[PDB]
RNA sequence: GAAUAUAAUAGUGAUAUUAUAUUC
RNA sequence: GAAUAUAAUAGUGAUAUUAUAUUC
């Protein structure tokens, strides 16, 4: 073992007393030891004729592996069996026997959800203790709350079974969209209701010890000026008529370079695919043209945004890569036309990407900050957060594409090194290297994310700069810093309540939400037995019929018959995953000319090698009327759904 | 995930062809990744309708936990359920269910032996691949060899059950008591037959790669001398003569001080003084209890002489002092009160001699010389020091900490159940991997050739050194004949690898059969249990404890006592190291109650729902009521009285 | 196709730095030599010229290196020549050196040519290369050359000195007990060679390890035999000692008794008597007794280091070689003939056999059973053991697979010793040391006997002190390596300072060690024989040639000795062996020297180590081993005789 | 492939779009 | 013949004896 902190004992104390409790402690103060202590006490509290059974809930695989290894290494010596079940090792194994024959079971929540729904696990009465890692996710349709729905449904019912103690683990419970303290109080009470918690454990009598371990990094706010247009009066006309040669085909009833323009191009593109035409032959031409036009427009928009947030050079390289991929996917008259127009004006560019006269002031401010902090301390470890995955290697190539930052060794963390560039890590996650500097490049999320991000630099002297060219970001961070105060104050206020009163308010909210969920069930579909024709979305070619489509596990959708096999092509999948009882063998694209529109994937399901498609790649025409309707999700498309039968 | 050494592939190659293989490679080359590769390939080789089941055999708990951790972390992603069963998690669990429902199972061999004997595991046919760590232990009746006994007994018999592939992992197969080449070769063949192996995988093509990753440390031999003239030994010898005279007053004992022969002698005498009966039963209990004390004190004096022989005089002095303080804290006896005074009478001489710098152990001066001259050339040296007894561990820690010349050292302890130098008794096989030691000093310490080869793993870096400090020549002799034995081993293997695999399989087979029915004959005796009820006296005070009629046998191994009569014959102390073996749980240790005795009887455990005393015959002397003759027994299975199986009744 | 570690070893020397080079025996030092020399020669401008001298303590190494250097550098346009003792004289070396760019020498040549004054100074050269530079110490020729070098260096002269490169596998640590002593020893060795750099492989160690393999060493400590033979042959010399003690006024078998017999024998050579006729008799008896006791002792030794038959046959050879039996020798030969019948029934007895021979036979059997094409080399201390073990090999039925050869084709070569590495070696698989341990240097050099993988070495002995003597050599090697690695960290300036101070120190020691010449007593003295005390000649008749050799000008002496053909004639200096000198007395036959054909006249050269010197006045008898210890009126020989 | 979460944007909202991340 | 080196054994050592090897 190892000598623990006092605030750890303090945090684990309400849990060891057998009370369902939510533990709220700063990120990286060692919640793992708290879990181990709670589990140890809970397991070794039982008599000889009875035995306990603990279940742990990690939301992601790294935490799964880590916690499993630690728990197994620590508790085996005590004579307790520790195991784990994730999606990889969940198939073709009796999970009920795995649960029964073990004392500690580390799970991803989806496993327990699926097994409860299926029936392999009768009730939650099997466990004597449930622990939720990052219990702030216990809300809405998240698997955690899906479990707690079962828990409460058993609790709030005549059917009485020994329900397990519930422990939550987090650094922030959240406040929702609360404008004041009394609303945040209601939010926290609602969460405690969702977790059936009667206690909220925080550090109080040992704060002086805790604050010598986890240091809050100072948060500097860097508001910079925007660019002042070497890439604005060039792609403008390009966008103008690349929209209007699409208007050459038909008239269609909004500033450029924004997200609204993105939404506009998207909905327009999703409104062009339904242009019914008696010619049909040239309907394909029209749709395949307009699709290309819009697909070029939106990526032009992407280039504009990337330029607006990063180097203009990367804004070019983006489009160059795009047209490269377009030329690699087969040459079309339209595609080679737009490409010709692009490369005609490309000579004017590149040279513009080569002037220091037009350099993003944001990147110059970032260069200033980095140079300063690495001058004051060369052994600085910096972590950087960006909005999109496009800006990652953009800022990377910006770093090594600069002699001023020759002291930097960029690293990537998306789906040894001085600085690590990343998108956005979910929750605390597996602990990485400790950083002395945290930079937020136009990146601001929720309050919980803000509080959790402090774990990146919980050492003394750690700093955090928020670099942006927008005020809305700044205010969006300030409101979070206020929300934290609201949360802490609401919690400290709730900790003054009597346990019973709190319990009955919780029970009240629980009964309320239960009634809501019960009455929420509704007569949703009247299945249309009419056979519908599924066409392609790009070239409008006939893909299949609804009569040929089979549904697997009430989630996935395949196509039968040898007719469809001559309608698609396939290339080996880039990231061959393994989901459920499936296995991604390859990808599936259209076959009509070199359309090559993505239709779905080709999988190996048991002893079958079958195509699985997504409805958001097809247009649902009616064989009778002709009304071409669109569906973004399969569950939105209600038709005669026939379960997949191996008899075929 | 990445960059496997080519010699690793070379070693895993025969095992990736289904061939039962013994792998022989230097310690530290990375046998774990070899295991991972063999196991992985073994798992991906099975089609869709079939599945494999690999089992890993670890001899020690740290190795168990480590391997379970690695295998779990590596094969979880692929989709293989990895689990483990040790002695701590073996009770009240469905082993059949745990074994089936998992793809990879890490076990301590005793678990499999027990569960096979119990019948919970029908046959080894459930497995498709068995891996043995430190497979050179597959000999005599070590658990590995028992498992392989079951394997062979299923193989050679009429049983046609599909047996799993067998892989062994070692750095040295050993040669045994071989004196030449074709003896070592026959030994190795016997071991391969014990493991059903037909291939011995070693590095041959990728030697140049291996010899740059695992370096053979340079060895050295330091032959010195003990103390020229010892005054400590004289005083202790005269004390010994005094005590021996005090003991000779009662009986006439029908050799040299400070030797092991005298230890054996005083053990035999102490044993023979506990079968001296008297009709008074109060003169018996007063004479035997005194003789026990005398022999014990003589023994402690001997241990002190050995300690002083190997270390400082202060170490032996503190040893004796701690002994006398311990028996003084136990409660002064009438036959021991004089001994402490006799010792304190010469304590002034001993203490004044233990401080005199001129008569100091020259072995320690040579060791200090080595340490000094080695840390002077490299101050960041990490040293590891091997000694025989733990008394020497403590002694050398106190010596290092208590010496101005070695004020640069920070000694640590590593015995049985940061820092510059690490002092340790011995490590079974390779063991868990600790920090590299570019200096391995052996202080009067030699073992088998296997340990000699495995110890080189401690310093597998370039320039790493190894010393053998001793005052005895037989030590060095043993080391060099060990090296010659290593030559014999390597050459025997190198010659076996040139043979025909079919021919080798034939030999293996006809060694296996021969052994199989040499195990058949004899081995079936059944000494008739005499039903006569015998008394059980305390070996120290000769007082009555219980009868053989009150003694019940639990699980054919342990032994308890019944009645509320035995209860008033003992007291108990909270056990210093409580454990949980099998279906038991140590709660306390049990001692006698007759006044100044307090002799070790047994322990107090919680078996199932019962709180019971478990005793050892090693601490009791048996007295036949009929004949009146007293007999001494050490092991319970040597006392063939009538076994009375344990039952929840009574 | 040069190796990288070779270039690495040559790198410091190619920077004009005086460098000692350490690298395992047989890693291609010749290539490094050629590289360094090549770079040294092509460095000079047009107006200047380069001149390199390569030393060699062995004629075979001399001819190998001369051949290689000549074949290599002839193309580039450099004249390569060599000088040895066979072609050292009747030639102007002064001009030979001047007319060449590369000169390969045996060091004694340059020493003698510097002493004679034929060569002014070492300024003539620009680069000197010492092969086996670990010999640069004491009174060795290398150290003499370096004495000249240092004398010109530290001296007031400012003449240009040549760059000094040394080649070795081990610099040695002398008798160092710790790292400091080893370190300073290595430092004074550097000062002896005026070195500032010690080049070892460090960057390309992996390559060197991939080329040269360290053979695995084993030690075999057996016990000594059982010995009736011991006592049986002992009472012979107890009886002999009894006989010798009857005319004049401890453990048998070991060296103490040997040098005891030696010193006593030398003490009987000075036992005088007025008769000078009974004197010769009693001292010839006292001579025969000791000279026989010695052979008996040595027989007792060979008995232990071999089989009893070897020692027996040795004695039977001695007694039959000393015959061509005298009246005094008749008793010894009769008492020995009365020893043969009881000795040989045990000397043929299979019961009493040497444990060392048993274990050796076992080792050979094993290693040849494993590999039938094994090449074995066996080192022994004496030649008696050479022939004895050859006879034992060809005599033992079990070893009928061996083809023993001699080194003082074949399956196993039996050898005494090889000074340093030597030339081309039969690369063996098995090296065996039969009661043979030298120093650390010769050990590391012995590693070169098997630089191939799988090669093995054995140390067969009964004495533990031998094993200890080897282990301490290993520890000494460790100390050497460590001290070198520590020296390679010092800055060159500080090192040069230390070296300079050591040089001035040692030079001061030498200059203050030189004692003046003793006063030669011109008074005459009678030089007479030691075996029979017979008057050989007087000092006035004796004349000295080349201040080294000594002859006699007198026909009276010419009739006082006999001449018999040399066992192995050879040529030295300006001389030429042909015969050998013995005492002309009937039953004496004692070695006096040799007769040679020096230049024109044939003259007899004698040794003082076979003559005892009495005084014409006092008559005091004295012994002298070397002519350097015997000071007198040294009258220079010259042709008119 | 499907589900879930977070952020921004349009909207009165149920929602929708995109971005990002996770899980089965 | 002379010179020189290495090892062993005596000696506090300077040295000496012996063995082995080399060289002019
Ligand atoms: O595409 P899958 O059906 O196999 O499922 P998945 O996990 O990748 O979903 C990711 C989504 O992003 C799009 N996608 C998938 N791939 C392989 C690519 C892309 N988009 C780009 N630009 N390049 C790719 O290689 C899919 O639409 C999917 O829904
Ligand atoms: Mg699914
Ligand atoms: Mg001469
Ligand atoms: Zn299409
Ligand atoms: Zn008792
Ligand atoms: Zn004579």
Helices (H), A422-544: 447-453, 471-494, 499-520
Chains A and C touch (3+ CB pairs under 8 A): no
Protein-to-nucleotide distance from the CA of A142 to the C1' of D5, whole angstroms: 7
C window 408-467: Cβ near strand E (< 7 A): 408, 416-419, 437-439, 442, 465
Which among A48, A76, A89 has the least Cβ separation from residue B88? Answer: A76
What length is written for chain A?
648
Q: Do B495 and C221 touch (CB under 8 A)?
A: no
Chain B contact probe: residue of C216, C219, C483 with most B CBs at under 10 A:
C219
Strand order in the sheet with B551-554: B551-554, B558-561, B610-615, B600-607, B586-592, B570-574
Work out whether the CA dihedral B277, B281, B285, B286 comes out positive or negative. Answer: negative
Q: Do B484 and C218 touch (CB under 8 A)?
A: yes
Helices (H), A163-225: 181-194, 207-210
Protein-to-nucleotide distance from the CA of A93 to the C1' of D23, whole angstroms: 19
Atom of ligand 1 nearest to the CA of A612: 3
- E-only strand ranges, B485-579: 534-538, 544-547, 551-554, 558-561, 570-574
Which H or E element spans position C356? helix C355-370
Determine the Cα–Cα distance for residues B471 and B467; give it in Å rounded to an integer: 13
Q: Which of C411, C390, C4 is nearest to C204 (CA)?
A: C4
The SS3 assignment for B530 reads strand
Q: φ and ψ at C456, to 5 degrees?
A: -130, 160
Protein-to-nucleotide distance from the CA of A442 to the C1' of D14, whole angstroms: 31
- In the numeric block, the tokens 């490269």 are attached to A324
* Orientation of helix C308-321 relative to helix C278-304, angle to 10°: 160
Tokens representing residue B597 in the block = 């005795």
The SS3 assignment for A193 reads helix
The neighbouring-strand residues paired with B530 are B641
- E-only strand ranges, C56-178: 80-83, 102-105, 127-131, 163-168
Is any atom of strand D within 7 angstroms of residue A415's beta carbon? yes
Determine the Cα–Cα distance for residues C174 and C182; give it in Å rounded to an integer: 7
Spatial neighbors of A197 by CB under 8 A, at least 6 apart, are: A20, A21, A22, A166, A168, A191, A506
> Contact, A439 vs A383, CB < 8 A?
yes
One-character DSSP codes across A504-526: HHHHHHHHHHHHHHHHH------
Which residues of B are less than 8 Å from A91 in CB distance?
A: 79
C window 77-136: Cβ near strand E (< 7 A): 84-86, 88, 106, 108-109, 112, 135
Distances (CA, A) of A627 to A274, A379, A524, A620, B98: 8, 65, 22, 8, 58
> Contact, A56 vs A83, CB < 8 A?
no
Which residues of B are less than 8 Å from C453 in CB distance?
A: 207
Spatial neighbors of B20 by CB under 8 A, at least 6 apart, are: B165, B166, B167, B195, B196, B197, B198, B199
Q: Distance between the two ends of chain A, CA-based, in angstroms? A: 60
Distances (CA, A) of A603 to A572, A591, A610, A617, C295: 11, 18, 6, 17, 98
Determine the Cα–Cα distance for residues A221 and A477; give it in Å rounded to an integer: 9
Determine the Cα–Cα distance for residues A306 and A390; give it in Å rounded to an integer: 8
Helices (H), C419-545: 440-446, 464-487, 492-511
Helices (H), A44-136: 61-75, 95-100, 109-118
Which H or E element spans position C624? none
What length is written for chain B?
650
* Orientation of helix C278-304 relative to helix C383-395, angle to 10°: 50
**CA-based angle C134:C140:C146, to the nearest 5?**
75
Tell me whether C206 touches chain B (CB under 8 Å): yes
Is any atom of strand E within 7 angstroms of residue C515's beta carbon? no
Tokens representing residue B155 in the block = 């193989």
Spatial neighbors of B645 by CB under 8 A, at least 6 apart, are: B552, B553
Distance A579 CA to ligand 1 centre (A): 14
Give the ligand whose atoms come closest to the C-alpha of residue C591. 6
Atom 10, ligand 1: residue with shortest CA distance: A575
Q: Do B483 and C218 touch (CB under 8 A)?
A: yes
Determine the Cα–Cα distance for residues C552 and C539; give it in Å rounded to an integer: 9
C-alpha B134: how far from chain center: 15
Tell me whether A609 touches chain B (CB under 8 Å): no
The neighbouring-strand residues paired with A506 are none
Tokens representing residue B380 in the block = 């960041």
The SS3 assignment for A158 reads coil
- Residues with Cβ–ion distance below 5 A, ligand 3: C 548, 573
Which among A65, A76, A88 has the least Cβ separation from residue B79? Answer: A88
One-character DSSP codes across C199-261: E---TTHHHHHHHS-PPEEEEEE-PPP--HHHHHHHHHHHHHHHHHHTT----TTSHHHHHHH
- In the numeric block, the tokens 């490299």 are attached to B378
Tell me whether B410 touches chain A (CB under 8 Å): no
Q: φ and ψ at A525, to 5 degrees?
A: -120, 145
> Contact, C81 vs C103, CB < 8 A?
yes
A window 539-598: Cβ near strand D (< 7 A): 555-557, 577, 579-580, 582, 584, 598
- Residue B162 CB: number of other CB atoms within 10 A? 11
Q: How many angstroms is the resolution? A: 3.3
> Contact, A294 vs A265, CB < 8 A?
yes
- In the numeric block, the tokens 């002014």 are attached to C120
One-character DSSP codes across B585-645: -EEEEEEE-STT---EEEEEEEETTEEEEEE-GGGEEEEETTT--EEE-SSGGG--BPP-B
Spatial neighbors of C52 by CB under 8 A, at least 6 apart, are: C37, C40, C41, C101, C102, C103, C125, C126, C127, C128, C129
> Contact, A214 vs A231, CB < 8 A?
no
- In the numeric block, the tokens 């590769």 are attached to B37
Burial class (CB in 10 A: 0-12, 13-18, 19+), B87: middle
**CA-based angle A302:A307:A308, to the nearest 5?**
95
Determine the Cα–Cα distance for residues C528 and C612; give it in Å rounded to an integer: 6
> Contact, B251 vs B287, CB < 8 A?
no
List residues near ligand 1 (CB under 6 A).
A 574, 584, 601
Determine the Cα–Cα distance for residues B68 and B73; give it in Å rounded to an integer: 8
Q: Which of A279, A213, A217, A204 is nearest to A249 (CA)?
A: A279
The SS3 assignment for B346 reads coil
Is any atom of strand D within 7 angstroms of residue A111's beta carbon? yes
- Residue A584 CB: number of other CB atoms within 10 A? 18
Tokens representing residue C496 in the block = 């040069």
Chains B and C touch (3+ CB pairs under 8 A): yes
Which H or E element spans position A586? strand A584-590
One-character DSSP codes across B161-211: --PPEEEEEES-----S--SHHHHHHHHHHHHHHTT--EEE--SSSHHHHT
Spatial neighbors of B477 by CB under 8 A, at least 6 apart, are: C221
Q: Do A86 and B76 touch (CB under 8 A)?
A: yes
Q: Do B373 and C178 touch (CB under 8 A)?
A: yes
What is the DSSP code (8-state) at residue C402?
-
Q: Distance between the two ends of chain C, CA-based, in angstroms? A: 63
Q: Which of A100, A127, A53 is nearest to B93 (CA)?
A: A100
Is any atom of strand E within 7 angstroms of residue C594's beta carbon? yes
- In the numeric block, the tokens 């992603």 are attached to B77
Cα-Cα-Cα-Cα torsion C123, C129, C131, C133, nearest 10 degrees, comes to 70
- Residue A17 CB: number of other CB atoms within 10 A? 11
Determine the Cα–Cα distance for residues A202 and A172; give it in Å rounded to an integer: 11
Strand order in the sheet with C197-199: C80-83, C102-105, C52-55, C127-131, C163-168, C19-22, C197-199
Determine the Cα–Cα distance for residues B569 and A628; give it in Å rounded to an integer: 97
What is the DSSP code (8-state) at residue A621?
E
Nearest residue in C to B224, CA atom:
C468
Q: Distance between the two ends of chain B, CA-based, in angstroms? A: 61
Tokens representing residue A364 in the block = 């110059």
Determine the Cα–Cα distance for residues A316 and A303; give it in Å rounded to an integer: 7
| CB-contacted nucleotides of strand E (7 Å) | 1-10, 16-24
Tokens representing residue B247 in the block = 């003991």
Instruction: Give residue A461's region: left, alpha or beta (phi > 0; psi -120 to 50).
Output: left
> Contact, A419 vs A410, CB < 8 A?
yes
Tell me whether C369 touches chain B (CB under 8 Å): yes
Q: How many helices (H) and strands (E) does chain C have?
A: 19, 23
Tokens representing residue B281 in the block = 């039963």
Beta strands A218-223 and C456-461 are unpaired
Specify which residue's alpha carbon is closest to the C1' of nucleotide D10: A260
Which residues of C are less than 8 Å from B476 in CB distance?
A: 467
Q: Do B220 and C366 touch (CB under 8 A)?
A: no
Atom of ligand 1 nearest to the CA of A598: 27
What is the DSSP code (8-state) at residue B212?
T
> Contact, B173 vs B489, CB < 8 A?
yes
Is any atom of strand E within 7 angstroms of residue C174's beta carbon? no
Q: Which domains, and CATH codes, for chain A? A: 1-215+498-525 (3.40.50.300), 216-228+360-497 (3.40.50.300), 229-359 (1.20.1320.30), 526-648 (2.170.150.30)
Which residues of B are less than 8 Å from C222 in CB distance?
A: none
- Residue C30 CB: number of other CB atoms within 10 A? 16
Strand order in the sheet with A218-223: A218-223, A463-468, A437-441, A382-385, A419-422, A411-413
Tokens representing residue B546 in the block = 């219980």
């Amino acid at each position: 073992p190892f000598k623990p902190r006092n605030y750890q004992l303090e945090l684990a104390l309400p849990a060891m007393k057998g009370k369902n409790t939510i533990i709220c402690a700063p990120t990286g103060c060692g919640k793992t030891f708290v879990s181990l202590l709670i589990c140890e006490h809970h397991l070794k509290k039982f008599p000889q004729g009875q035995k306990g059974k603990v279940v742990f809930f990690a939301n992601q695989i790294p935490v799964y592996e880590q916690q499993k290894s630690v728990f197994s290494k620590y508790f085996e010596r005590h004579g307790y069996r520790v195991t784990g079940i994730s999606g990889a090792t969940a198939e073709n194994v009796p999970v009920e026997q795995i649960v029964e024959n073990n004392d500690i079971i580390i799970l991803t929540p989806q496993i327990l959800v699926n097994n409860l729904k299926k029936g392999t696990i009768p009730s939650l009465s099997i466990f004597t203790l449930m622990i939720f890692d990052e219990c702030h996710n216990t809300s809405k349709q998240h698997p955690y709350n899906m479990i707690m729905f079962n828990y409460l449904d058993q609790k709030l019912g005549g059917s009485s079974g020994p329900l397990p103690q519930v422990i939550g683990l987090t650094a922030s419970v959240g406040v929702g969209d609360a404008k004041n303290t009394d609303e945040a109080l209601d939010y926290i009470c609602k969460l405690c209701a969702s977790l059936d918690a009667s206690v909220i454990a925080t550090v109080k009598h040992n704060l002086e010890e805790l604050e010598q371990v986890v240091y809050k990094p100072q948060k500097f706010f860097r508001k910079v000026e925007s660019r002042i247009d070497k890439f604005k009066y060039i792609i403008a006309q390009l966008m103008r008529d690349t929209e209007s040669l699409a208007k050459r085909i038909c008239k269609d009833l909004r500033e450029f370079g924004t997200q609204k323009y993105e939404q506009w191009i998207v909905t327009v593109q999703k409104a062009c695919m339904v242009f019914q035409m008696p010619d049909k032959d040239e309907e394909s031409r029209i749709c395949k043209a307009l699709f290309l036009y819009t697909s070029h427009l939106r990526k032009y928009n992407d280039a504009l945004i990337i330029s607006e947030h990063a180097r203009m050079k990367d804004a070019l390289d983006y489009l160059k890569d795009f047209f490269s991929n377009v030329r690699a996917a087969g040459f079309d008259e339209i595609e080679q036309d737009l490409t010709q127009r692009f490369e005609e004006k490309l000579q004017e560019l590149e040279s513009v990407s080569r002037d220091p006269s037009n350099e993003n002031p944001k990147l110059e401010d970032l260069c200033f900050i980095l140079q300063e902090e690495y001058h004051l301390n060369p052994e600085t470890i910096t972590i950087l957060f960006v909005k999109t995955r496009a800006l990652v290697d953009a800022l990377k190539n910006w770093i090594e594409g600069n002699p001023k930052l020759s002291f930097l060794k960029p690293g990537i963390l998306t789906g040894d090194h001085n600085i690590l560039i990343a998108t956005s890590v979910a929750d605390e996650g597996i602990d990485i290297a400790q950083c002395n500097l945290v930079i937020l490049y136009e990146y601001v999320g929720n309050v919980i994310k803000m509080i959790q991000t402090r774990g990146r630099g919980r050492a003394r002297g750690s700093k955090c700069f928020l670099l942006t060219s927008n005020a809305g970001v700044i205010e969006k961070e300030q409101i979070n810093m206020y929300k934290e105060k609201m949360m802490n104050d609401s919690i400290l206020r709730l900790q003054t309540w009597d346990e019973a009163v709190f319990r009955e308010k919780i029970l009240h909210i629980q009964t309320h939400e239960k009634f809501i969920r019960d009455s929420q069930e509704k007569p949703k579909p009247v299945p249309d037995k009419e056979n519908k024709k599924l066409l392609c979305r790009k070239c409008k070619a006939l893909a299949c019929y609804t009569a040929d489509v089979r549904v697997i596990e009430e989630c996935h959708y395949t196509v039968l018959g040898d007719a469809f096999k001559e309608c698609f092509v396939s290339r080996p999948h880039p990231k061959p995953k393994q989901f459920s009882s499936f296995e991604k063998r390859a990808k599936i694209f259209c076959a009509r000319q070199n359309c090559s529109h993505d239709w779905g994937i080709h999988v190996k399901y048991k002893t079958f090698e079958i195509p699985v498609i997504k409805i958001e790649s097809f247009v649902v025409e009616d064989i009778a009327t002709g009304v071409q309707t669109l569906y973004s999700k399969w569950k939105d498309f209600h038709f005669e759904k026939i379960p997949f039968d191996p008899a075929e």
